Amino acid sequence: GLMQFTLPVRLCKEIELFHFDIGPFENMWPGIFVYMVHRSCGTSCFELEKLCRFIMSVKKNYRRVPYHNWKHAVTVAHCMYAILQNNHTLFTDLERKGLLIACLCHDLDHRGFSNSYLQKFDHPLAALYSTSTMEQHHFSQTVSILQLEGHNIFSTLSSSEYEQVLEIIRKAIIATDLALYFGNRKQLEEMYQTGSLNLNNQSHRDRVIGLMMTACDLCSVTKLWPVTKLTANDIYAEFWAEGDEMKKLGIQPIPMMDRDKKDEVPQGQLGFYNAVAIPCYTTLTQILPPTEPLLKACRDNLSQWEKVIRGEE
Ligand SMILES: Cn1cc(-c2ccccc2)nc1/C=C/c1nc2c(cnn2C)c(=O)[nH]1
Ligand SMILES: [Mg+2]
Ligand SMILES: [Zn+2]
């Protein structure tokens, strides 16, 4: 186990900063993810032979959709990595493992369509799992992959270590359901401001890890303007597709998903940052101050949307 990964000096340096873009080179991403595993957890956390086969089974099962794809998976994994490196005493050796594996599997086998659209299309998955449909699907594929002859990266763990980490990953993936985020933050809000929040409380840790997971998923809004602007495209490319399929079911889609209502995007982005991203990072920073760069960035991008509305870009 004396193999390290190293990265070109520029990547080596930039990868530690929250706003790091993993670049257009698909071939390097798995290096970048192992790289984060080693520096974030240690060199013998996982057997390499096995991690390299688990990372590639994962890639294979993420489809070619505009946003909900392999680059997403990895972008989200780096952001949890960033979070963990800047808070390196608040997380256990099990939670540092699981959470990065969670982030890479958090959207396995996404089709590009929302839990809304499965249920109205009457997809089979919406029969097998009433709520958090996709997310429960994604956790299912994570464990599918894990039981493939050769792929069990957690092999070496004790019974309770292993049983615990699958329960960290399960709650982590399910907390990426943006439905479930609104309630979860407002609780962490009360708890923090009444000062009853306790990190030795397992039920509280969970809520917090959930907030981390939502902060990592939305991390497109914490990048430098041009990354965030170009990611927005890939996002609306999926929304409008799902909109086209709603129309085909005889259903008029919410303006967000209607491609005939492009013009009204600058406005709808505003609502989101105000209604979701700014609250999200605001709380996360009040709980974990070394994650301020995410809130500072997010506010910068809000400001840049403000400027798109005023015909200034
Ligand atoms: C709430 N919302 C409303 C609209 C919207 C409404 C009318 C016309 C055009 C757009 N656009 C959004 C934002 C969408 C969104 N942006 C996101 C997400 C992740 N990254 N970003 C920027 C996400 O999950 N949702
Ligand atoms: Mg998801
Ligand atoms: Zn995601």
Swiss-Prot record:
Residues at the catalytic site: H68 (proton donor)
Binding site for a divalent metal cation 2: D107
Annotated residues for binding of 3',5'-cyclic GMP: H68, Q269
Transmembrane segments: none
Tissues/organs with expression: Abundant in the putamen and caudate nucleus regions of brain and testis, moderately expressed in the thyroid gland, pituitary gland, thalamus and cerebellum.
Binding residue positions for 3',5'-cyclic AMP: H68, Q269
Subcellular location: Cytoplasm, Cytosol
Binding positions (a divalent metal cation 1): H72, H106, D107, D217
Domain PDEase, chain residue ranges per copy: 1-312
Quaternary assembly: Homodimer.
Task of the protein: Plays a role in signal transduction by regulating the intracellular concentration of cyclic nucleotides. Can hydrolyze both cAMP and cGMP, but has higher affinity for cAMP and is more efficient with cAMP as substrate. May play a critical role in regulating cAMP and cGMP levels in the striatum, a region of the brain that contributes to the control of movement and cognition.
Family to which this protein belongs: Belongs to the cyclic nucleotide phosphodiesterase family.
UniProt domain comment: The tandem GAF domains bind cAMP, and regulate enzyme activity. The binding of cAMP stimulates enzyme activity.
Annotated disease: Dyskinesia, limb and orofacial, infantile-onset: An autosomal recessive, early-onset hyperkinetic movement disorder characterized by axial hypotonia, dyskinesia of the limbs and trunk, orofacial dyskinesia, drooling, and dysarthria. The severity of the hyperkinesis is variable.
Protein name: cAMP and cAMP-inhibited cGMP 3',5'-cyclic phosphodiesterase 10A
Organism of derivation: Homo sapiens
